[PDB]
Design a protein around this motif. Structure first.
Motif, PDB file in Angstrom:
ATOM      1  N   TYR A  15       9.941   1.941   9.122  1.00  0.00           N
ATOM      2  CA  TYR A  15      10.337   2.483   8.050  1.00  0.00           C
ATOM      3  C   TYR A  15      11.084   2.043   7.199  1.00  0.00           C
ATOM      4  O   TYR A  15      12.154   2.207   6.053  1.00  0.00           O
ATOM      5  N   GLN A  56       9.933   9.663  17.002  1.00  0.00           N
ATOM      6  CA  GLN A  56      11.920   8.872  16.859  1.00  0.00           C
ATOM      7  C   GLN A  56      12.530   8.443  18.309  1.00  0.00           C
ATOM      8  O   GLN A  56      12.474   8.927  18.869  1.00  0.00           O
ATOM      9  N   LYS A  92       4.761   1.201   7.309  1.00  0.00           N
ATOM     10  CA  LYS A  92       4.255   0.828   8.508  1.00  0.00           C
ATOM     11  C   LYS A  92       2.912   0.271   8.516  1.00  0.00           C
ATOM     12  O   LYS A  92       2.345  -1.016   8.965  1.00  0.00           O
ATOM     13  N   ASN A 126       2.730  17.929   7.095  1.00  0.00           N
ATOM     14  CA  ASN A 126       3.804  17.526   8.375  1.00  0.00           C
ATOM     15  C   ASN A 126       3.623  18.320   9.104  1.00  0.00           C
ATOM     16  O   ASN A 126       3.456  18.100  10.460  1.00  0.00           O
ATOM     17  N   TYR A 178       1.810  10.864  15.515  1.00  0.00           N
ATOM     18  CA  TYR A 178       2.481   9.676  15.399  1.00  0.00           C
ATOM     19  C   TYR A 178       3.372   9.262  14.974  1.00  0.00           C
ATOM     20  O   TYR A 178       4.358  10.202  15.808  1.00  0.00           O
ATOM     21  N   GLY A 224       5.385   8.085   2.760  1.00  0.00           N
ATOM     22  CA  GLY A 224       6.708   8.058   3.617  1.00  0.00           C
ATOM     23  C   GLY A 224       7.836   8.085   3.233  1.00  0.00           C
ATOM     24  O   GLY A 224       7.877   9.663   2.293  1.00  0.00           O
ATOM     25  N   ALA A 225       8.531   8.946   4.097  1.00  0.00           N
ATOM     26  CA  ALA A 225      10.034   9.238   4.209  1.00  0.00           C
ATOM     27  C   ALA A 225      11.268   9.096   4.556  1.00  0.00           C
ATOM     28  O   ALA A 225      11.110   7.612   5.825  1.00  0.00           O
ATOM     29  N   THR A 226      12.373   8.995   3.475  1.00  0.00           N
ATOM     30  CA  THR A 226      13.809   8.986   5.099  1.00  0.00           C
ATOM     31  C   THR A 226      14.133   9.858   4.462  1.00  0.00           C
ATOM     32  O   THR A 226      13.688  10.853   3.604  1.00  0.00           O
ATOM     33  N   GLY A 227      15.604   9.803   4.763  1.00  0.00           N
ATOM     34  CA  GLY A 227      15.940  11.130   4.588  1.00  0.00           C
ATOM     35  C   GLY A 227      16.977  11.185   2.898  1.00  0.00           C
ATOM     36  O   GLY A 227      16.392  12.672   2.954  1.00  0.00           O
ATOM     37  N   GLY A 269      10.552   3.669   3.415  1.00  0.00           N
ATOM     38  CA  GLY A 269      10.287   5.085   4.697  1.00  0.00           C
ATOM     39  C   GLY A 269       8.748   4.739   4.997  1.00  0.00           C
ATOM     40  O   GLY A 269       8.633   4.004   5.457  1.00  0.00           O
ATOM     41  N   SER A 270       7.942   5.265   6.082  1.00  0.00           N
ATOM     42  CA  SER A 270       7.330   5.129   6.669  1.00  0.00           C
ATOM     43  C   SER A 270       5.846   4.232   5.802  1.00  0.00           C
ATOM     44  O   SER A 270       4.775   3.827   6.254  1.00  0.00           O
ATOM     45  N   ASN A 277       7.363   7.386  15.163  1.00  0.00           N
ATOM     46  CA  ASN A 277       8.121   5.553  15.039  1.00  0.00           C
ATOM     47  C   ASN A 277       8.462   4.517  16.330  1.00  0.00           C
ATOM     48  O   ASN A 277       7.523   3.210  15.550  1.00  0.00           O
TER      49      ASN A 277
HETATM   50  B1  LIG Z   1       8.271   7.780   8.140  1.00  0.00           B
HETATM   51  O1  LIG Z   1       8.516   7.908   6.425  1.00  0.00           O
HETATM   52  O2  LIG Z   1       6.571   8.741   7.908  1.00  0.00           O
HETATM   53  C1  LIG Z   1       9.288   7.872   9.446  1.00  0.00           C
HETATM   54  N1  LIG Z   1       9.792   8.377   9.063  1.00  0.00           N
HETATM   55  C2  LIG Z   1      10.941   8.245   9.340  1.00  0.00           C
HETATM   56  O3  LIG Z   1      11.110   7.385  10.657  1.00  0.00           O
HETATM   57  C3  LIG Z   1      12.410   9.159   8.724  1.00  0.00           C
HETATM   58  C4  LIG Z   1      13.948   8.576   8.420  1.00  0.00           C
HETATM   59  C5  LIG Z   1      14.185   7.449   8.672  1.00  0.00           C
HETATM   60  O4  LIG Z   1      14.652   9.998   8.271  1.00  0.00           O
HETATM   61  N2  LIG Z   1      13.295  10.860   7.853  1.00  0.00           N
HETATM   62  C6  LIG Z   1      12.692  10.284   8.266  1.00  0.00           C
HETATM   63  C7  LIG Z   1      11.529  11.546   8.667  1.00  0.00           C
HETATM   64  C8  LIG Z   1      10.883  12.295   9.516  1.00  0.00           C
HETATM   65 CL1  LIG Z   1      11.511  11.092  11.196  1.00  0.00          CL
HETATM   66  C9  LIG Z   1       9.662  13.276   9.493  1.00  0.00           C
HETATM   67  C10 LIG Z   1       8.902  13.034   8.347  1.00  0.00           C
HETATM   68  C11 LIG Z   1       9.953  12.784   6.694  1.00  0.00           C
HETATM   69  C12 LIG Z   1      10.650  11.515   7.670  1.00  0.00           C
END
Ligand SMILES: *[B]([O])([O])[C][N]C(=O)C1=C([C])ON=C1C1=C(Cl)[C]=[C][C]=[C]1
Ligand SMILES: *[B]([O])([O])[C][N]C(=O)C1=C([C])ON=C1C1=C(Cl)[C]=[C][C]=[C]1
Lengths: 358, 358
Positions: A218, A117, A64, A286, A147, A314-317, A60-61, A149
Motif C-alpha cells: 500500500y 494486516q 497492489k 468493506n 483480502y 485503495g485507502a490509507t488512514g 493505498g491498496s 496485505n
Molecule cells: B488497501 O488500501 O485496501 C489496504 N489498506 C491498508 O493497509 C491501510 C492502511 C495502511 O491504513 N489503513 C488501511 C485500511 C485498511 Cl487495513 C482497510 C480498509 C481501509 C484502509
C-alpha cells in the motif's frame, strides 16, 4: 474537455465532495484513450495549497496493482512462476503449513487465511520470518479468499528476489521508468515533498506510517497525470514497447479465481462488462470486500478479457483512491482524494461517469 | 547460405535419406530468424517429379500445432475458455462421464484415455456423437496424458463453434492468411495438385484418406516455405500484427502439464533448453510417445518460456514430418519427407543440426 465529459464529471463529483466532506480531489477520465483532468479543493488545508495535476496522493491498496504487474513482469522474464512453492524463494520458511502454498496463493489472497494486516509489532526481518513461520491457516490453500496485505505483500517481496533488486529498485526500473511515471514514488523524495498532499482523518493531517511490507501492499504515492498514464497502459498493454512488461500487464488481468461475480487478477479485480452496478457498488463495501469467501479456481486462468470492468479501491488512514477501466471501450477513470471516504460512494460515482460515456 | 549451415545440413540429412530410403525430402533451417532451404529427391517417383520448395507434403500430426494455435486465437478472442466444460460447446454430449472434462483436457490429451484413433467406421455426425457418448474413460480427468487424435481433434472442432465458421474456414482466415501461408491447405485445390507429393508406404504411392476429425488432428498439407514461415511465427509471435493470433501462439506454448522433462502445450510440446538429446530422441519413439504417462498440473500454466526446445513430430501412412525451434536462439528447423520413417532418426538429425548452430 468536451462538454459532455465536463458535465458528467462535475455533476457527479461536486455532490460527492460535499456529501463526503472531502478536502481535496483529483479525477482523470480516459476517453477514447485521451486523458481529461479535474481538480477541486485542498492538498493542504492549513497552508491553503490547492490540489493540482502535480499533487501527490497516497494510493493505498491501488499500489497492489503495481505489485501485481511487477510480479507479472517477473513471471514473463522467467524469474519466477506462480506455480512455484513459496519455499522456493524463502527456504527459511520451513513450517509444514507452507507445503502446498504457491506464489499464486500469495498473490491472490488464497493461501488459507493470511491476515489483512501485518502486526504493527513486526518490524525487523527476523520478526517477519517468525510471523509467517508461526501463522496457522484456517483453510487449505486455494479454497478461500481473504483480502490481505500480508499475502500480496509477501508475494511482492519474493517475486523480486531472483532479480537481486530491492523491491523499490525493481518497481522503478521495470515499471515506473518504462511507463514514464516520473512522479510516482514508493518513498517521496525531498524535491517532491512540496507536492505531497496531507491526508485527513477526523480533521487531522496525516501521512501513512512505515510498516512491514508497506511498499508492496500500500505504499505508492502518485499524481493524477501519472495515474492516468497507468490506466492508459493497462487499457492498451500492446502499445508498451518493453516485452515482459506488456506481458506482465496482461498476466495481472488474467482471471485466476471467482467469488460471486468477481474475478481475482494479480492486484486488479475484474467483472464482466456490462456489469450490474449494484454489484460492484455494494461489493466494494468493506463488509464484503474484506470478508472471507469461498473461491472457485479458474483452471486454467482466463487471459485478460477485453469486455471487463477492471478496478481496484485503495485507502490509507488519510486517503481514498479508486481506479476502474473497460478495455473494450478504451474508457477509464482515476479518483484520488485526501480523505478515506466509503468505497461504495467511489464506485457509484465512477459508474455514473463511465456509464454516461458509453 | 552460410557455409556452416550448408555443411551440417548436408552431412546430417544426406546420410539420413540414404539410411531410411527416403524418396523425397525438404528441410528449412531458420538461423538468426532467416530461412535456408534444402531439397532432395522425388515428390512423385514414377513421374520423376523433383521435390521443390513448392512441393506440398502431408504434415500429419504437426497439424496439431495449427489446431493448438487456432484454439489459442479463439481463447484470446474471448470465444472460448479452456476452463469450460466440453458440454458447453456440444450440448448434445450429455452422458455422465463427460462431467468434469474441460476443453483443456481435450486439447492436452488428459481427458482420461480418449483413444489414439477415432474408429475408421465413424464417419457421420451421428456416428461421432454416438462414439463420444459411448466412450468410457480409463482414468479420471487430468491425471494421465494419452496422446490422441480423438482428444485434440474434438478440441479443434469445438473451439471454432462460437465463431460460427467451419474448422477449415476458421483456420484459413484466422491463421493461414494473416501469416501469409499461401500454399498451406486442409483440402488441396485443383491448382495445387501438381505440387502435392505422393507419400510412400511399402513402395506404394499413397495419400491420407478421409477420416473423422482428420482436418483437426492430422490434415494440413504445406510446403517447406510456408512451414519455415510457420516456425518464424512461432519463434517470434510479437512480430505478428493480429493481436489475438499473437496471443494464441503464445498460449499454445504455455506449459499446462508436465510429464518427466516434457511440458504439454496446445499442440506443441516443450522442454527446457538446454535439452538432453537422449531424452527427446528416445522420447519420440512411439513405444513411449503413444504410452499413457502420469501428468502433474502446472497451476497456473507457465507462460511461454523463451529458453525452450519446442517441437512436434507428425506422420501419416506415407509421410514423416518434424518441426523444432528454440525461441531464445531465433533458431529452428522443419524436416518434411514423403516416407513415414522412425521418429528418433528425425529428432536425432534435428538435434545435430540445431546444436551445431547454437
Ligand atoms: B488497501 O488500501 O485496501 C489496504 N489498506 C491498508 O493497509 C491501510 C492502511 C495502511 O491504513 N489503513 C488501511 C485500511 C485498511 Cl487495513 C482497510 C480498509 C481501509 C484502509
Ligand atoms: B500424428 O501424426 O501423430 C497422428 N497420426 C495419425 O493419425 C496417422 C495417420 C493418419 O496415418 N498413420 C498415422 C500414425 C499413427 Cl495413428 C501413429 C504413429 C504414426 C502414424
Amino acid at each position: 474537455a468536451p462538454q459532455q465529459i465536463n458535465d458528467i464529471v462535475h455533476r457527479t463529483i461536486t455532490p460527492l465532495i460535499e456529501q463526503q466532506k472531502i478536502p481535496g480531489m483529483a479525477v482523470a477520465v480516459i476517453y477514447q484513450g485521451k486523458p481529461y483532468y479535474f481538480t477541486w479543493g485542498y492538498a493542504d488545508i492549513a497552508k491553503k495549497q490547492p490540489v493540482t495535476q502535480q499533487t501527490l496522493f497516497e494510493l493505498g491498496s491501488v499500489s497492489k496493482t503495481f505489485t501485481g504487474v511487477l510480479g507479472g513482469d517477473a513471471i514473463a522474464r522467467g524469474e519466477i512462476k506462480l506455480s512455484d512453492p513459496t519455499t522456493k524463494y524463502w527456504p527459511e520458511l520451513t513450517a509444514k503449513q507452507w507445503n502446498g502454498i504457491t506464489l499464486l496463493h500469495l498473490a491472490t489472497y488464497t493461501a488459507g487465511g493470511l491476515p489483512l494486516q501485518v502486526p504493527d509489532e513486526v518490524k525487523s526481518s527476523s520478526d517477519l520470518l517468525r510471523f509467517y513461520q508461526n501463522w496457522q491457516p484456517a483453510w487449505a490453500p486455494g479454497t478461500q479468499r481473504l483480502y490481505a496485505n500480508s499475502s500480496i505483500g509477501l508475494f511482492g517481496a519474493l517475486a523480486v528476489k531472483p532479480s537481486g533488486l530491492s523491491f523499490e529498485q525493481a518497481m522503478q526500473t521495470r515499471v515506473f521508468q518504462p511507463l514514464k511515471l516520473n512522479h510516482t514514488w514508493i518513498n517521496v523524495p525531498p524535491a517532491e515533498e512540496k507536492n505531497y498532499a496531507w491526508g485527513y482523518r477526523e480533521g487531522k493531517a496525516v501521512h501513512v506510517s512505515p510498516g512491514a511490507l508497506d511498499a508492496e501492499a500500500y505504499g505508492v504515492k502518485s499524481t493524477i497525470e501519472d495515474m492516468a498514464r497507468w490506466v492508459q497502459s493497462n487499457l492498451k498493454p500492446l502499445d508498451i514497447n518493453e516485452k515482459t512488461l506488456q506481458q506482465g500487464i496482461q498476466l495481472a488481468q488474467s482471471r485466476y479465481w471467482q467469488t460471486g461475480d468477481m474475478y481475482q487478477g494479480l492486484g486488479w479485480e475484474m467483472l464482466d462488462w456490462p456489469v450490474n452496478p449494484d454489484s460492484i457498488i455494494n461489493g466494494s463495501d468493506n463488509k464484503i470486500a474484506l470478508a472471507a469467501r469461498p473461491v472457485k479456481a479458474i483452471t486454467p486462468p482466463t487471459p485478460a478479457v477485453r469486455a471487463s470492468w477492471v478496478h481496484k479501491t485503495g485507502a490509507t488512514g488519510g486517503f481514498g483512491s479508486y481506479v476502474a477501466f473497460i478495455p473494450e471501450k478504451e474508457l477509464g477513470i482515476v479518483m484520488l482524494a485526501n480523505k478515506n471516504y466509503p468505497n461504495p460512494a467511489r464506485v457509484d460515482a465512477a459508474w455514473q461517469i463511465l456509464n454516461a460515456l458509453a
